[PDB]
Scaffold this active site. Structure first.
Site, PDB file in Angstrom:
ATOM      1  N   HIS A 143     -56.351  34.695  27.095  1.00 31.95           N
ATOM      2  CA  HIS A 143     -56.465  35.922  27.397  1.00 31.95           C
ATOM      3  C   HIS A 143     -57.916  36.480  27.154  1.00 31.95           C
ATOM      4  CE1 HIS A 143     -52.145  37.030  28.396  1.00 31.95           C
ATOM      5  NE2 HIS A 143     -52.648  36.372  29.325  1.00 31.95           N
ATOM      6  N   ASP A 169     -36.376  28.378  28.262  1.00 35.93           N
ATOM      7  CA  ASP A 169     -37.523  28.403  27.317  1.00 35.93           C
ATOM      8  C   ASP A 169     -37.453  29.211  26.274  1.00 35.93           C
ATOM      9  OD1 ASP A 169     -38.461  30.327  28.706  1.00 35.93           O
ATOM     10  OD2 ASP A 169     -40.236  29.104  29.729  1.00 35.93           O
ATOM     11  N   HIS A 201     -45.616  33.581  33.088  1.00 37.17           N
ATOM     12  CA  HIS A 201     -46.150  33.004  31.841  1.00 37.17           C
ATOM     13  C   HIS A 201     -46.355  31.611  32.089  1.00 37.17           C
ATOM     14  CE1 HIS A 201     -41.785  33.020  30.431  1.00 37.17           C
ATOM     15  NE2 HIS A 201     -42.236  31.826  30.908  1.00 37.17           N
ATOM     16  N   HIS A 260     -54.543  32.855  37.408  1.00 40.27           N
ATOM     17  CA  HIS A 260     -54.451  33.467  36.116  1.00 40.27           C
ATOM     18  C   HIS A 260     -53.610  32.469  35.311  1.00 40.27           C
ATOM     19  CE1 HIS A 260     -54.023  36.403  32.672  1.00 40.27           C
ATOM     20  NE2 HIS A 260     -52.908  35.705  32.540  1.00 40.27           N
ATOM     21  N   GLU A 261     -52.454  32.243  35.830  1.00 36.47           N
ATOM     22  CA  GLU A 261     -51.546  31.188  34.954  1.00 36.47           C
ATOM     23  C   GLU A 261     -52.152  29.815  34.898  1.00 36.47           C
ATOM     24  OE1 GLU A 261     -49.341  32.655  33.091  1.00 36.47           O
ATOM     25  OE2 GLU A 261     -49.237  34.458  34.166  1.00 36.47           O
ATOM     26  N   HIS A 292     -44.492  29.340  34.993  1.00 27.70           N
ATOM     27  CA  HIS A 292     -43.145  30.125  35.524  1.00 27.70           C
ATOM     28  C   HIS A 292     -43.477  31.421  35.765  1.00 27.70           C
ATOM     29  CE1 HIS A 292     -40.753  27.425  32.345  1.00 27.70           C
ATOM     30  NE2 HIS A 292     -41.363  26.863  33.355  1.00 27.70           N
ATOM     31  N   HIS A 307     -54.088  29.443  31.909  1.00 27.25           N
ATOM     32  CA  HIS A 307     -53.474  29.158  30.568  1.00 27.25           C
ATOM     33  C   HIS A 307     -53.284  27.504  30.665  1.00 27.25           C
ATOM     34  CE1 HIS A 307     -52.979  33.138  29.240  1.00 27.25           C
ATOM     35  NE2 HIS A 307     -52.323  33.601  30.338  1.00 27.25           N
ATOM     36  N   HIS A 337     -34.063  31.279  31.203  1.00 27.81           N
ATOM     37  CA  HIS A 337     -34.096  29.954  32.233  1.00 27.81           C
ATOM     38  C   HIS A 337     -34.636  28.753  31.377  1.00 27.81           C
ATOM     39  CE1 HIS A 337     -37.878  32.381  31.661  1.00 27.81           C
ATOM     40  NE2 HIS A 337     -38.486  31.354  31.946  1.00 27.81           N
ATOM     41  N   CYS A 352     -49.443  39.673  32.675  1.00 26.67           N
ATOM     42  CA  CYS A 352     -48.989  38.320  32.063  1.00 26.67           C
ATOM     43  C   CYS A 352     -47.936  38.335  30.700  1.00 26.67           C
ATOM     44  CB  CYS A 352     -50.183  37.697  31.881  1.00 26.67           C
ATOM     45  SG  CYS A 352     -49.703  35.629  31.119  1.00 26.67           S
TER      46      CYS A 352
HETATM   47 ZN   LIG Z   1     -52.205  35.143  30.787  1.00 25.82          ZN
HETATM   48 ZN   LIG Z   2     -40.453  30.397  31.521  1.00 20.73          ZN
END
Ligand SMILES: [Zn+2]
Ligand SMILES: [Zn+2]
Ligand SMILES: [Ca+2]
Ligand SMILES: [Ca+2]
Ligand SMILES: [Ca+2]
Ligand SMILES: [Ca+2]
Ligand SMILES: [Zn+2]
Ligand SMILES: [Zn+2]
Length: 229
Positions: A193, A135, A148, A183-184, A161, A187, A133, A59
């Site tokens: 993590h 960010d 992420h 996983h994402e 993303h 967040h 892209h 990640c």
């Molecule tokens: Zn992560």
């Molecule tokens: Zn991004």
């Protein structure tokens, strides 16, 4: 080779362990911090195990820092998501199915519910992109950072993303979209993590897992239930 190992460690530590911002010991302490967090023997050396870990896909969110226009948890219980675009690697229904199953992972252990939107603003905006892209975290090509996501809050907060220079697959035979998405989403809901190698929220991609046997670790469950009860 050896000098590149040096360059790889520096870039890895700057990326995920806030190395930057004349004492050779400064890099040593960051090695040690990374080794402790990721479960390596704490030698402070760029040894074979450490460098293998640094070469592995993972990640893109850093491992240090937890810290805000945002928030530690969503205040609403009913959240929305939107799949903004699709990878060409997989059929539309496979991408949809992967995200739905990843959402169900968290629904099963929280009072949260999720509704899909096809247009306009959703809380969790989900997309695929390469390199820069729009960010602060450009993707990096095949391997290394896979994806992420950002913690709860308005706007780009909560968004996910995926790096579309990965080859996204529907089985454990590649970079599995479902596993990374799950996983994402962690967040997106406010988790950071984990140092538990068995936990979903561990930062490295887990490529040795049978999908039928996938389950959240007790660390993942304790973390999300500390936020949402
Ligand atoms: Zn992560
Ligand atoms: Zn991004
Ligand atoms: Ca269909
Ligand atoms: Ca958002
Ligand atoms: Ca990548
Ligand atoms: Ca791709
Ligand atoms: Zn190995
Ligand atoms: Zn917006």
């Amino acid at each position: 080779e050896e000098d590149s190992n040096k360059d790889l460690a520096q870039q890895y530590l700057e990326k995920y362990y806030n190395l930057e911002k004349k004492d050779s010991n400064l890099i040593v302490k960051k090695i040690q911090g990374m080794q402790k967090f990721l479960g390596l023997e704490v030698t402070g050396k760029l040894d074979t195990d450490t460098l293998e870990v640094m070469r592995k896909p993972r990640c893109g969110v850093p491992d240090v820092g937890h810290f805000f226009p945002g928030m530690p948890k969503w205040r609403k219980t009913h959240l929305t998501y939107r799949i903004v675009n699709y990878t060409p690697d997989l059929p539309r229904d496979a991408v949809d199915s992967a995200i739905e199953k990843a959402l169900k992972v968290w629904e099963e252990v929280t009072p949260l519910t999720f509704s899909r939107l096809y247009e306009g603003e959703a809380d969790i905006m989900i997309s695929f992109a390469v390199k820069e892209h729009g960010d602060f975290y450009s993707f990096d090509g095949p391997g290394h950072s896979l994806a992420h996501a950002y913690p709860p809050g308005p706007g780009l907060y909560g968004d996910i993303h995926f790096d579309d220079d990965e080859k996204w697959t529907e089985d454990a035979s590649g970079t599995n979209l479902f596993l990374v998405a799950a996983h994402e989403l962690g967040h997106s809901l406010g988790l950071f993590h984990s140092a538990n190698t068995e936990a979903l929220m561990y930062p490295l991609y887990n490529s040795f897992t049978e999908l039928a046997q996938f389950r959240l670790s007790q660390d993942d469950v304790n973390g999300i239930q500390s936020l949402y009860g």
